[PDB]
Structure formats: C-alpha cells, structure tokens
Design a protein around this ligand. Structure first.
Ligand SMILES: CCCCCCCCCCCCCC(=O)O
Ligand SMILES: CCCCCCCCCCCCCC(=O)O
Ligand SMILES: CCCCCCCCCCCCCC(=O)O
Ligand SMILES: CCCCCCCC(=O)O
Ligand SMILES: CCCCCCCC(=O)O
Ligand SMILES: CCCCCCCC(=O)O
Length: 585
C-alpha cells in the first residue's frame, strides 16, 4: 500500500513475535515432514532478513513481492525432492504459476500420527521452562497437521492455549482445570476447521451471489446503523478475502484481512460505535476483536418492511430492472431488525420473497398476489424458534450427557439404517451444541447454535454419502442450503426397519474396557445404547435403563474379577440372555 518494502511493512504492523509465529505456520503447512529445528532456523533467517528491510527499505529483495520471497525460500529447501519431490518442479515454473503449483501440492491428509497428550505435570513443566518454544512446538505440530487452516485463526487459538496453560500450570488441581479446557479448545478448533471448509464448499457449489447474501445478513445484524452502501462495500471486500482464504493463499488472505481491519476501524463512525476498544488494539488483536465484536443497537426510528416491499406499486419494476440491489436491501433491512435470527433463516425468508416476486411479478395484478408474503415468514421463523426452545428445555432438565442419550435414542429411531459411529458422533456433537449455546438468552441462541449446527449436519452428510445407507438422509444432504435443516427436522420414525439379530457388534468385548476414562466409557455406553435400539426400535426408557444397568454390572463384575477373558466369555453369552428378555424380546 505505497510501501517500497512489503515485508518490513508487514513486520511493523505484525510485530516480531507475531511475525515469527506466522512464518512458522506458513512453512510448516508445506514442510510438514521437515524437522522442527529446520523450521526454527528458517523463521530466524526470514525474520533477520525482514529486519534488514525494516531499517533500509532500499536494501535487497526488500522490493520483491511476498509470493516471490516466499517461493524463493521454499525452493531453497535442498532436501525437498527427497522428502517432497513433486513440489520441486514447482520451482522451475515462474510466478504466478509457481505459487499456484505449491498450493496444489499441499497434503490434506499429512501422513503423521496423532498427538500423544502428555501428563499434566510434564506439560506444565515444559511450558514453564520455555513457554515460547512450547507454543512454537504446538504451532508446528498443529500447522503441519492442518495445512489449509487459516494461520491468523490458528495463532489466536495458540494464544488461548498459552492462556489456559498460564492459568492451570499455576493452579492446584491442574488436571481438574486443564483437561476440561483442552477438551473445550480441541472441540472449538475442529469446529473452526470444519466451518472454514464448509464456507469454501458453499462458495464453490453455491456460487458467490449466495456467499454475498450470507455476508449481507451477517454484517447488517452486527452493524444495524451502517448505511447500506458501507455494508455493500464490506460485502465486496470480505467476498475477496474469503475467495483467497479458500484458495489457500496465506499471504493474500492474511494481508487483505489486515487491509479490511484498517478500513473498518477508520470508518468506525459510519459502521458501528462498538468498534471503540477494537480499533485501538495491535494489528492482529483488533483484527479478531472486530470479528468478535458485539452487535450495535438498531435505531428505534425503524418502520416495517411492508411499505417498501409489499405495499409499494413500483416494486415489480424494481425487482426486474435491478434484482441484486433490491433484494440486497430487503436482506439488509430484514437482518438489521432481527439479530436473533440465524443467517440461513434470513436467506430462507429472502428466498421466499424472491420466489414470490418471480411468480407474482409476471402476472395479472402483482400486488394482491404477493401482498400476503410476510405471513408466509411467520412459520419459517417459528419452526426453528420452537425447536431450539424445546431442545434447550430438554437439555436443561437433563444434563449434556443425558441429553446426548435422549437424541441418540430419538435419532436412531428416525434413521436406524445409519452407521452406529455416525449416530454416536452426531448425537454427541448436538449435545455439545446445547452445552455451548443453551446457556445464552433466547435472542442469542439461534446465531450461536448456527455455526455449530451447520458443521455437524455437514459432518453426517459427508460421512453418510461416503457409503450411503438411507435415502431419507441422502435427500436432506443433497437438498439445497436453505432446505437442509428443515428436511432434517421433518424426518419421522422409520417403521419398515427390521431390527438386528441379537448377536455381537457391541456385545463382544475384552478387558481393554476396564481401563478407560469417563469419556471413553460413556462413548461405549452410547455405542451400546444405539445398538440396543437397533435390536428393539420401540424399546423404552425404563427398558433401556434396565439393560444398561445389567451392562454396567457385567462390567463392574468381570472387571473386578480374578480372571477377565474367561469371565467376559462366560458372562458374555449370559448378558445377551438377560438383555434379550429384558427389552421384551
Ligand atoms: C441443543 C442442541 C442444538 C440444537 C438442536 C436442535 C436441532 C434443530 C436445529 C434448529 C435450530 C435452528 C437455529 C440454529 O441452530 O441456528
Ligand atoms: C439423525 C438424523 C435426524 C436428525 C439429525 C440432525 C438433527 C438436528 C437438525 C434437525 C432437527 C431435528 C428435529 C428434532 O430433533 O426432532
Ligand atoms: C459393554 C458395557 C457398557 C457399559 C459402559 C462401559 C463400562 C462403564 C459402565 C458404567 C458404570 C461404571 C462401572 C462400574 O460400576 O464399575
Ligand atoms: C504473514 C505475512 C508475513 C510475511 C510472510 C512471508 C515472508 C517471506 O517468505 O518472505
Ligand atoms: C442469493 C439468494 C438470496 C436472495 C438474493 C439476494 C442476493 C444478494 O444480496 O446479493
Ligand atoms: C464445538 C463443539 C462441537 C460441535 C461442532 C461440530 C464439531 C465437528 O463436527 O467437528
């Protein structure tokens, strides 16, 4: 932005620590197989080189582009071909195709084992020793396992990791403090990874007019006082930002985000008052602050839509000759008044409005034909309101764990053809959504649950379609964006299903069970619960509790037994007995 040097410019804004944090990510996400130490020297080189340009913006390569700089360094990797090989012919190519070629050679599934969580004591100790290397090690390990993960986001997760350690590493029961939180942040990070991929998948299969419509609604809720032209300006920026972030171009994604963080804070008066504190913080501190900001208050000087979008005579004209803008306004208007709504409900209403006009416009008397359309919103709006109210009541009268159990039983009776894992996972995650969002007051529940919800349905939509088993689920999964959830809400109990033969599955076991945590054990109860319901699709709570206890007892006993694999074998057969009867079969 009129800065001879772009790197030293980025270095001033970011800062030394953030700058090293971000390079480490970038390189880790291609150099997944290179050693950590080789990375540290790399960041040290890049960081030294950038300070040379900080001092003299007219030094060397300090005029060159970041893409060139980056790609040059990555070609310097001399062990590349041995470890990577194909990513080396990316270097023969010149820019811009060179960076395009690297981009293509990122591995979505690095061939790397999962992380072995150490013990609280040793981790907190290694954290204390050298905090800075600890969080670099973490960044390295995560980045290299999540290559298309957005680097700023990851870095903010990093700082949150730092903060939870700083807290629990100076605490008494440490374990009974950290592990609860490590489980929270792990879940938030998969939430974020999966949300990214969803938006990028949505952009691709739903164009961009769609993503733009998403943006119109989201911003207008956050910035109800923004004048529509500002909103539109941001929609366009954000559109590009997201377009690049999805492409997998860190540099562009990261630097365009900083630009947009600049503009927004600069025009705080027109956009929102709530940017007060944000716009003060450092570069990638405000940045997340803006995105984390709370909704400004709407005006009270606010009429109904009706006059402009239902009553007005030159409406059909307006649609036809300028469709995008007219509906654009609808969206902004509808949204700015309704921050309690989820985005895709707002899209659903807009699409309902669209679908009317397309019809009523090229018709006899358009007015009386479309003049009833806001009454068609009422149920589209209430259906989800009821769902969340009623699920949250249930989540509240039960706890997380017993709420998962409810949904397990419910959803297995709906779609018993689905794999047991998919049901367990889906019901668990839905419960977590109750943990995260039910605590909030109604006006913030839909927005809060939406991100999570849409990612979870996706996860089942993905899994299922890898090996389809249910035509009712297929339909919902290949229904449109806006019809996806209602389809899922309309699933009814499956009658035709023929229960399973009362045999093994989750009835053959070993003493590998006696040695498991609450978490691993409740996933096994949950697994065992779903199976039961498959064996008896009309079993009951009082029937299931009874079998579940006989299960629980079979564990307590065989686990507290002198021999195990003999006990589990003898009593193994005799539990299918005391279950088959109990269920009423
Ligand atoms: C309490 C767990 C999450 C909610 C479970 C209800 C499943 C139906 C989804 C309808 C909710 C619409 C609003 C939203 O989630 O954004
Ligand atoms: C297990 C397949 C059926 C539903 C799976 C996802 C549930 C959440 C979104 C749809 C809401 C369903 C309403 C309900 O729970 O009764
Ligand atoms: C195959 C058995 C399913 C039950 C879940 C795994 C074992 C945990 C049972 C819950 C009670 C704890 C055991 C005990 O009381 O000793
Ligand atoms: C994340 C923006 C900071 C600069 C990263 C690329 C530097 C380089 O490889 O020359
Ligand atoms: C894209 C489906 C939603 C209705 C049209 C509004 C789109 C826009 O504001 O760009
Ligand atoms: C954040 C708690 C978990 C709910 C979000 C969905 C997780 C996933 O599908 O990976």
């Amino acid at each position: 932005d009129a800065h001879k040097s772009e790197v030293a410019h980025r270095f001033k804004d970011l800062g030394e620590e953030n700058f090293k944090a971000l390079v480490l990510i970038a390189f880790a996400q291609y150099l997944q197989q290179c050693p950590f130490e080789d990375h540290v020297k790399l960041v040290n080189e890049v960081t030294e080189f950038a300070k040379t340009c900080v001092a003299d913006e007219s030094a060397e390569n300090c005029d060159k582009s970041l893409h060139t700089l980056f790609g040059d360094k990555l070609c310097t990797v001399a062990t590349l071909r041995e470890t990577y090989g194909e990513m080396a012919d990316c270097c023969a190519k010149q820019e811009p195709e060179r960076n395009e070629c690297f981009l293509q050679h990122k591995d979505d599934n690095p061939n790397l084992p999962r992380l072995v969580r150490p013990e609280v004591d040793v981790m907190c100790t290694a954290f204390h020793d050298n905090e800075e290397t600890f969080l670099k090690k973490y960044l390295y390990e995560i980045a290299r396992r999540h290559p298309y993960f957005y680097a700023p986001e990851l870095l903010f997760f990093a700082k949150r990791y730092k903060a939870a350690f700083t807290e629990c590493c100076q605490a008494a029961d440490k374990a009974a403090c950290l592990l609860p939180k490590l489980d929270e942040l792990r879940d938030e990070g998969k939430a974020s990874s999966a949300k990214q991929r969803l938006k990028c998948a949505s952009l691709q299969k739903f164009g961009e007019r769609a993503f733009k419509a998403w943006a119109v609604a989201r911003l207008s809720q956050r910035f109800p006082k923004a004048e529509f032209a500002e909103v539109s300006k941001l929609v366009t920026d954000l559109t590009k930002v997201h377009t690049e972030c999805c492409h997998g171009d860190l540099l562009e994604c990261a630097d365009d985000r900083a630009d947009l963080a600049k503009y927004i804070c600069e025009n705080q008066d027109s956009i929102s008052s709530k940017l007060k504190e944000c716009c003060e913080k450092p570069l990638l501190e405000k940045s997340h602050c803006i995105a984390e900001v709370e909704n400004d208050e709407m005006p009270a000087d606010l009429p109904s839509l009706a006059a402009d979008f239902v009553e007005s005579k030159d409406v059909c004209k307006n649609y036809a000759e300028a469709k995008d803008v007219f509906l654009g306004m609808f969206l902004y208007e509808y949204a700015r008044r309704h921050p309690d709504y989820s985005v895709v409900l707002l899209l659903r209403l807009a699409k309902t409005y669209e679908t009317t006009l397309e019809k009523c416009c090229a018709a006899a008397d358009p007015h009386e034909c479309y003049a009833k359309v806001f009454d068609e919103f009422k149920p589209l709006v209430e259906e989800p309101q009821n769902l969340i109210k009623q699920n949250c009541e249930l989540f509240e009268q039960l706890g997380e764990y017993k709420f998962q159990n409810a949904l397990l039983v419910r959803y297995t009776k709906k779609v018993p053809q689905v794999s047991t894992p998919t049901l367990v996972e889906v019901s668990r995650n839905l419960g977590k959504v109750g943990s995260k969002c039910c605590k909030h007051p109604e006006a913030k529940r839909m927005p809060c649950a939406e991100d999570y919800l849409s990612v979870v349905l996706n996860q089942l939509c993905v899994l299922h379609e890898k090996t389809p088993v249910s035509d009712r689920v297929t339909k919902c999964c290949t229904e449109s964006l806006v019809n996806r959830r209602p389809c899922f809400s309309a699933l009814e109990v499956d009658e035709t299903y023929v229960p399973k033969e009362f045999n093994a599955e989750t009835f053959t076991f070993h003493a590998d069970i006696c040695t498991l945590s609450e978490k691993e054990r409740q996933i096994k109860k949950q697994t065992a619960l779903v199976e039961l319901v498959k064996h008896k699709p009309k079993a009951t709570k009082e029937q299931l509790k009874a079998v579940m206890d006989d299960f629980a007892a079979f564990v307590e006993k065989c686990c507290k037994a002198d021999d195990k694999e003999t006990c589990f074998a003898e009593e193994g057969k005799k539990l299918v007995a005391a279950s088959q009867a109990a269920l009423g079969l």
